[PDB]
Amino acid sequence: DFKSGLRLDGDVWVNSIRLDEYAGTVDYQNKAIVVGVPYDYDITRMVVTEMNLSEGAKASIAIGETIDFSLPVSLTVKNGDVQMSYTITVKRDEA
Amino acid sequence: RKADLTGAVSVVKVDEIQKQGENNPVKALQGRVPGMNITADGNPSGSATVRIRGIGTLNNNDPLYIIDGVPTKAGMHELNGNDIESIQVLKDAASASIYGSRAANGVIIITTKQGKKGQIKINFDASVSASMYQSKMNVLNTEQYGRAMWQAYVNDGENPNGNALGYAYNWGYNADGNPVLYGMTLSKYLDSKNTMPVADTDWFDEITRTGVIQQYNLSVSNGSEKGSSFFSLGYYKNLGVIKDTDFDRFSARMNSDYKLIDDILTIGQHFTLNRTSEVQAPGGIIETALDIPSAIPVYASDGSWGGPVGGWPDRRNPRAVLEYNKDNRYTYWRMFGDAYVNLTPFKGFNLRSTFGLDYANKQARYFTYPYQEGTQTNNGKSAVEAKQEHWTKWMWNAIATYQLEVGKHRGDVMIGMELNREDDSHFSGYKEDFSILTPDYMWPDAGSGTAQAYGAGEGYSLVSFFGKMNYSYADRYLLSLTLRRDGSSRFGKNHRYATFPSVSLGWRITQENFMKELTWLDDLKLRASWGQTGNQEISNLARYTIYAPNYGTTDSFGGQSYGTAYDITGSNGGGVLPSGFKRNQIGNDNIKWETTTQTNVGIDFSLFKQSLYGSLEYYYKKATDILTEMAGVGVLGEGGSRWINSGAMKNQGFEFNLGYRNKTAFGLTYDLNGNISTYRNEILELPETVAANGKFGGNGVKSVVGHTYGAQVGYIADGIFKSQDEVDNHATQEGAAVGRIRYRDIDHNGVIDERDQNWIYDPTPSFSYGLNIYLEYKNFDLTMFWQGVQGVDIISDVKKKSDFWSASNVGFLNKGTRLLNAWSPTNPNSDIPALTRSDTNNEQRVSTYFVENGSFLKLRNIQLGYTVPAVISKKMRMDRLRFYCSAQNLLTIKSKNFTGEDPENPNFSYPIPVNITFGLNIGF
Amino acid sequence: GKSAVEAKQEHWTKWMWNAIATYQLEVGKHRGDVMIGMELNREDDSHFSGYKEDFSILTPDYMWPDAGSGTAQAYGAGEGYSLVSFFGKMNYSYADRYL
Amino acid sequence: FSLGYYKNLGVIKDTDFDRFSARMNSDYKLIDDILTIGQHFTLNRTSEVQ
Amino acid sequence: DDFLDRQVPQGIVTGDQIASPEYVDNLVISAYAIWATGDDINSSFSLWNYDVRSDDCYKGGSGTEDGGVFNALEISKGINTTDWNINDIWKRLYQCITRANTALQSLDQMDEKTYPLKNQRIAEMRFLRGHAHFMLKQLFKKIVIVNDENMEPDAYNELSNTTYTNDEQWQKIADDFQFAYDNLPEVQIEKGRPAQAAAAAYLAKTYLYKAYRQDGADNALTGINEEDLKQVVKYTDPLIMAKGGYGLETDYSMNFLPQYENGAESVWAIQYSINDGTYNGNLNWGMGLTTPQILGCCDFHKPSQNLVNAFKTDSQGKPLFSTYDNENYEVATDNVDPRLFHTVGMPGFPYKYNEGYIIQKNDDWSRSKGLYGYYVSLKENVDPDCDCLKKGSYWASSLNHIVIRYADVLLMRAEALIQLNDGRITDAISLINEVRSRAAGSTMLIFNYKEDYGVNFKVTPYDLKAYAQDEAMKMLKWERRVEFGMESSRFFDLVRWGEAKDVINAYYVTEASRCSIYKNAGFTENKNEYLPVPFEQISASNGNYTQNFGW
Ligand SMILES: OC[C@H]1O[C@@](CO)(OC[C@H]2O[C@@](CO)(OC[C@H]3O[C@@](CO)(OC[C@H]4O[C@@](CO[C@]5(CO)O[C@H](CO)[C@@H](O)[C@@H]5O)(OC[C@H]5O[C@@](CO)(OC[C@H]6O[C@](O)(CO)[C@@H](O)[C@@H]6O)[C@@H](O)[C@@H]5O)[C@@H](O)[C@@H]4O)[C@@H](O)[C@@H]3O)[C@@H](O)[C@@H]2O)[C@@H](O)[C@@H]1O
Ligand SMILES: OC[C@H]1O[C@@](CO)(OC[C@H]2O[C@@](CO)(OC[C@H]3O[C@@](CO)(OC[C@H]4O[C@](O)(CO)[C@@H](O)[C@@H]4O)[C@@H](O)[C@@H]3O)[C@@H](O)[C@@H]2O)[C@@H](O)[C@@H]1O
Ligand SMILES: [Mg+2]
Ligand SMILES: [Mg+2]
C-alpha cells in the first residue's frame, strides 16, 4: 500500500573484469578497478573481453568493444532502478 | 437525586458510563455533560484534561474530585472506575462551595458502590479489545520524495542533479517551457561505506502496531441494616498503538460500614489500593516519524539500526528510539482511604467526623543507552536515573448537622471544620559509565562514572470553617445560604483568611395552585444562585524572595543552565568549584485569595409523566484578583517573576440538557439524551508584562485584553500569487514571487510588515453537543453516543509540515503527501504554494493559512449487547448473563476545510485509536 | 566542617499465589482427609540512595540534594528470588482414637 | 475494621517510634455455601528515630 | 494554631537571609558564573550569532531556514522587531547585569575593616556590569542604564532608555571601568578575576567607542572627539600593561590552543572548565553550533571567501588593498598571511592541526551541500583528540573565551594615535609593525605546509616613514580585519567607523555570485546598523522606550 514499486533490491556488484588477457583487482570501498600491464602495453586499444556483474545488472560498457584507457574510465552498473559508479584505471607496472 | 437540589448539578448515569469500557471514567464522560470540555490524547493511560464552564482562571484550572467525601486533584486514571455508583458534577459556585475551598473550577462528586441493604450480589466483568491506528499521516514514499525535491529545485531554478542525496533525475521541458520529470534513479547505498542501503520504509507502520486491551473486574457487595460491605478487584492492561508503550493497573477496593447501638455511632470506611505500571512514548516520537525520510532503512547492512548518513537530514531512528525507551517503566502506588464516625444523639442532630488519607508513591528507573545511528550518536554515553517521589495528603473533617420539620417548614443547618495538609517530596540518583548496558546490570552501584543527586520537598496546609443553612416552605420555596472562612499556608498572616458567601433560591412553580389544570406539565422548577468562591492554587513559595544554590548539576538543553559555579582560579576544573546563589523569584507579601463570583439561573422541566425532561441554564462567571505569575519587566533580570493579584476573567455561557424516553407499541424501548452548550470567554484586566509577553494570547504582538483566552494574532493569507502581474499589482513585500503566499495589507500602507497583523484565531467553539441513544428490543440493547463540536478553529503544524517544502528548521525532511498537489504552471488549479528550497517569503509566520476549521462530529461509542434469557440464566444459576461487542472512535465527520485528519487531535500528540471490544458480564 | 545529606529509598515486594484442593470423608468410624496444594512465591527487593555535600544553612529544611553544592554519589541495588512448591497432606483417624 | 495508633519515646533522648495501623478483613458467602470470597488487608505507617 | 505555619520553604534561602555577610563571596561567584552558564546556543556572549551581518562569515546550518531570523539579520532584509533572538539576547545581558547588581548590593552593606577585599570585590562587580552594558550598547544603540544596585524591583518599571543621551550613556558605562581601574589589584593570582590592566584596556575601548559621536536622531557619524582619544591614549599606555605583565605571545595559535589557557596575551577571558561536578561541565555551549559536520552536526559560523581573500597578501608582503577580492585565493601561486591557517580551515588542509582530519569539499564537512561554502572556522574549535571536548547534546569545549587581547589593545592605541593625528602616526605604524611581525613569526605549527601543500608565507612590516592619515587608517582597518577575523567584532568596528553601509553593500554585491543567499540582500543607510529595541520590551514599558531610528 505504501511501497513505490521502484524495485530497490537491485544488486549492482561487479565480480571481475578482463581487459584483453589481464584481470582487474576490484576495491569496493572506493569503487576502483585497477588493471596492470607490463610497462610497455599499448593502453589505447583494449577490448573488454569478459565482465560479470550480477543477475539483472547492466553496465554502460558493453562486451567486445574497444576503449582507450590512457585515463580512468567511468563505468555505471544499473540494476532495476538503482546504480553504482566505478572508476577503471590501467597502470604500466611502474617501478 | 441531585443532592443540592437548588444549584447547577449534572447527574451522570454510570450504567452507560461503564458501557464505553474506558479506564478513566472522566474520559468516559467526555461529551455527556454540558459546559464541560474533556481533552484526551489517546495514550494507554486514561489521562485527560477537564475544563468546567470554560477557562476560569490564569492558574491551574483542574476541577476538584471528591471520592467518598475526600477531595483530591489527582487524575482518576489511576483509580478503578468500575466501582462507581454515582457521579455528580457541581458547576455552580453556590452549590459547589460547601464541598471545599478548591471548588473554584467545579467539583466532581464520585460515590463508590456500597452494599445494598438486605442482599448479597457478585458481578464479574471481562473485556478484550483490539485498538487499531486509523489516523495514519500520509508521508511521501521514496519516489514521491524524489519528485518533490526535483520540483523544488526546478522551481527555484537550481540544478536538481545537485541534490547530492543520491538521486539522478532524467527531466526535460514541455512545449510551454515548464519542466517535466521523465524519471529518476537512486544510488543503492546512501553512504560511501556501503553500510546504509537505500530502501522504501513506512515509518508510521514500523512504529505502530495493533494494541490489545484486557479488563477484568470482580466485585461482591453484601448489605444489611446489621452493616454493609463491598469488595472489588480490578485489572486493566492496555498496549498502545505505538510500540513499546503500555499501561496496566491493579486495583482493590474495600468499603464497609457498621451501625451500632441502635442508630447511634455509625462507623464506616472506604479504602482503595492501586498499582499502575506504565511505559510512555518519548517526546515527539510522532514528530520524528513524520520528519525522517522514507529512504532511510530501518536496519543497516550489519544489522545495527539504520540512520542518516552523508547529506541526509539528522533525525534519530524512531524505531530505535522506541526500542531504547522500552525499559523506562515506572511503577505508581496509590492509596486512597478514609474513615468516618457519625454520632446521632437524638432525632435531628448528627456529628460526622471524617479522616481521609491519600498516599501516592512513584518509582522509576530511566536508562540512557548509547546509540550510533549513522551520523546520529551521543558519543557512547550510558547512564541510569533512579527517581522516587512521595505524595501524602491527609484531611480531617468535622460536621454538625441539625434538621427540623416544624409544620410546612423544613430547615437544616450544618457547621463544619476542615483541615487539609499535603506534603510532597522526591529525590533521584544519576550514574554513568556502564559496561554491559542492560536493565539487569544498570544500577547505580554497577555504574563507574560521574554521579549526581537531586532532591526537593514541599507542602501546604488549608483550614476552613463553613456553614450551610437550607430552608424549605411548603416544599415549594427553597432557600440556601452558605458561608466559608478559608485560610491557606500560601499567604501571609495578614491576608491568610478570607470569607466567601453564597445564596441560592428555588421555586417549584408546578406546586403552585394556579396551574393544577396543566396536567401535561409534570414538573417545573426555576432556580437562581449567586456565589463567591476562593482560589489559591499557586506555587507554595509564592510570597518569598527565593534564593537557590543552583550549582548547575541539572541537565539542560543548549547550555542555558543558569548555574552558579565558576572556575575562578582558572584551572579547567578538576575539583569542586566555588558556588553561590541565584534568585528564582521576587516575593510579594500582599497576595490574597482570588475571588470568583458566579451567577447561575436555571429552569428544570419534566413533561408527560417524566417522559420528556430537561434543563436550561445560563451562567456568568467573573474572576477577579487572579493570582498570576507576572514576568519581570526585562531589565529586572532573572527572578523577576512574581505572583500578583492583577487579573480579571469573564465567562458567559448557556447549557441545555434534554431527554426523551418512551416505549413503543411493538416493544422497542428508546431513550434519547441530548445535550448542547456554548460559552464565551474574555480577559478584562491583565498585568502589563503579561500582556506584553503574550503567554495568554496575542503572540506578544497585541494585548489579549478584551479578547478570548489564548487568541492569537497573525497575518492574513489572501491566496497565492499566480502571475508576475499579480505580484506587481499586490502591495510590495519581501520575498514575493510567483506561487508564494499573498498577505493582505491591513493598514493600506502599501508595504507588508509586522504591523499587518490582526486577530485570526479564537479557541472557543461556537457550540458543543452530544447525543446518547439507547434502544432495547427482545434482549438486544444498542447504545450509540455521538459527540460534535462546531465553530472551533485550530492551529495546525501538520499543515505547516505538509503544505510546504523547507519550512522546518532543517531541510530535506520528509513531508506530507498533499505536498505533491502544489501549485505549478502545469497544475494551475491549486491553492498550495509552489515548492521552494529557500523560505524567502518567510511563510513560517503565523497566518490564516495554518488556521483550520476544527468542526467535527464523531461517533464516540457504539455497543450492541445481548442478554441471555432469564430462564436460561437461572438454570445456569446466574442472575444475569450479558454479552456485548462495542466500538470506540469508529466514525468521524470533519469539515472539508480541514486538510489534516482527526480534528480532535490535529497535531503530533499521541494518536487516538479505534477500539473494537468484546466483553461479558456475569451476575451470580 | 563536613556537611552532607543522604536520601535513601528501599522497596520490598513479595507476592504469593496458593491453590488448595481438599477432600474429606466420614465412612463409618474412619475419618479421612486429603489435601493437594501448589504454591508460588516471588520476592523482589530494590534500593537506591543519593548523597550530597557542601551545605550552608545546615538545617533539615534546607538540606536537600538540590541545595547541596559539593560532591555527589549514587548507590543502588536490586535482588529477588522465587519459590515453587507442591505439597500433599493426608490425615486418617480411626474411632477418634488412632491418628 | 480496626484502627490503631502507638507512640513510644525512648529513655534515650531524641529516639522514638510511632505507628499508625488500619486493618480491614471481610468475607462473603454466596450462592448457598459455594463461592466464599474473603480478604484480609492491613496498612501500617511507622516513623522512627534510632 | 500553628497548623498553617508549621511548614516552611525547602532547599532555598529567603531574601532577608541572602543579605547576610557570609554569602557575599557566593554572590560574587554567582555574578561571575552567569557569564559562562547564561548563554544559549542561539545567544552566545561572543556575539558571533549577531556578527554574521558582517562580511567575515556566513551563517552555517542546513540552510536559510535553520535560524531564519539570523538569516534575516545576515541579509538585512525582513527583520522584525518581534524576533525571538533579539528579545532573548536583551533579556540575557540584562540578567547578567542584575546578578552583578545583586552582588554589589550585598557588598555595599558590609564593613570594610571586617572584609578587607570589599573595594576589590566591588570593582570586580562594577567591571562585570560595565562589560554587560558595553555589549548591550554595541548591539542596541539605546539601552537602559541599570547601574543603581539599591533600586527596588517596583522602581524598575520607571526606567527608560532615553534618560541619558548617547554620550551620557557612554560616560555612565565608562564610569564603572574607571572605578574598576582605580580599585583593582595590579596582578591577580586568581586568573578568573579581572586585573587592573584588563580594566584599563576595556575603559580605553569604551572611550574609543565614545569618541566617534553619534549625535542626532540618525545613526550617522558626527565628528571625532579629541578628548576621548586623549583618554584612550592615556589608559592604553604600555606602562600599565607592563605592570600587569601582559604582552603578545610568541605564536598566534597559542591564543586558541587549549594547552595555553590564561596566556600572556589573554588580558581577560571567560573561564570554561571540564570535569568539575557539573552535569557536563562549564563548557562553551555558546559555540556549540559552530563545530564542523565531522564532529557530528550543526556546522555553523562558516567563514567567507571574502575573508580568505582578505587574508591573501601580495608579492611584497602587504595586503592587497584593492584587488584582493577580484579572484579567489590560490594556494599554489599566491603569497598568503600565515594567520589564515590559524583562523580559517581551508579544504585540503589539516583541521585544527590534526593530520588525521583533512578537510574535503564533500558533504562530510558541509551541512548545507555547498550553499555556505566549505570553510571551517578554527579559532573557537579544538582538536577532537585533546579530550578538551564533550558531547552534551552539542559538541562543546573547555577552551577559554578571550574578551580582551593585547593585540586588541595595541590596535586600539594605534587607532587613537592615527585619529588624533598630532604628529604621532609613526607610533601607530610601529604598533602595526609589531602585530604583523608577531603574525609573520607565528609559523611554528604550519612550517611543513610549504613542502606539503605549496603554501608561500610572505608578511613584512612597514617602513617607519610619514603616512597620510587616510592611508594609515586604511592600513589599520586592514590589520584589524586580518587580525580579528572570526572573533565577532567586524560589524561593530564597521558601525563605529561609519562605513558599515558601503562595506556591507559591496560585500553583498561581490558575494552574491558565490553565495545564492545574497540575491535579495540590502543594507539600509540608517536602520540596519543597530538591532531594534525589542517590541515586547517596548510594549511592556509603555511610553518609556523609544525604538531606534528608521523603524
Ligand atoms: O522561543 C520562542 C520561539 O523560538 C523558536 C522558533 O522556532 O525556537 C527558538 C528557541 O528554541 C531554541 C532551543 O534552545 O533554539 C532552537 C533553534 O536552534 C536552531 C537554529 O539555531 O537549530 C539549532 C540546532 O539544533 C538541532 C540539533 O539537532 C539534534 C536534534 O535533537 O540535537 C542533537 C545534536 O547532535 C541531535 O540529536 C540532533 O542533531 O536541532 C534541535 C532543534 O530541533 C527542535 C526545534 O524545533 O525541534 C525539532 C526536532 O528536533 C528533535 O530533537 C528531533 O529528535 C525533536 O526535539 C524535534 O522533533 C528542537 O527540538 C531543537 O531546538 C539542529 O537540528 C539545529 O541545527 C534551530 O533549529 C532552532 O530554531 C532556543 O535557543 C530558542 O530560544 C521556538 O522554540 C519558539 O517558537
Ligand atoms: O512534583 C510536584 C507536582 O508535580 C506533579 C504535576 O506537576 O506531578 C509530578 C511529576 O509527575 C509527572 C511526570 O512527568 O506525572 C506525569 C505522569 O505521571 C502520572 C502517574 O500516573 O501522573 C502523576 C500524578 O500526577 C497527575 O498527573 C496530576 O497532574 C495525576 O493525574 C497523577 O496521578 C501520570 O498520570 C502521568 O502520565 C508529572 O506530572 C510531573 O513531572 C504533581 O503530581 C505534583 O503535585
Ligand atoms: Mg502594511
Ligand atoms: Mg578553561
Numbering used by the authors:
A (entry chain T): 4 to 98
B (entry chain A): 93 to 1016
C (entry chain I): 472 to 570
D (entry chain I): 323 to 372
E (entry chain B): 2 to 552
The publication says:
Here we show that for both the levan and dextran utilisation systems of Bacteroides thetaiotaomicron, the additional OM components assemble on the core SusCD transporter, forming stable glycan utilising machines which we term ‘utilisomes’. Single particle cryogenic electron microscopy (cryoEM) structures in the absence and presence of substrate reveal concerted conformational changes that demonstrate the mechanism of substrate capture, and rationalise the role of each component in the utilisome.
Upon addition of substrate, the levan utilisome undergoes large conformational changes, revealing the substrate-bound states of GHlev and SGBPlev, and demonstrating that the pedal-bin mechanism of nutrient capture operates in the presence of all OM-localised components of the PUL.
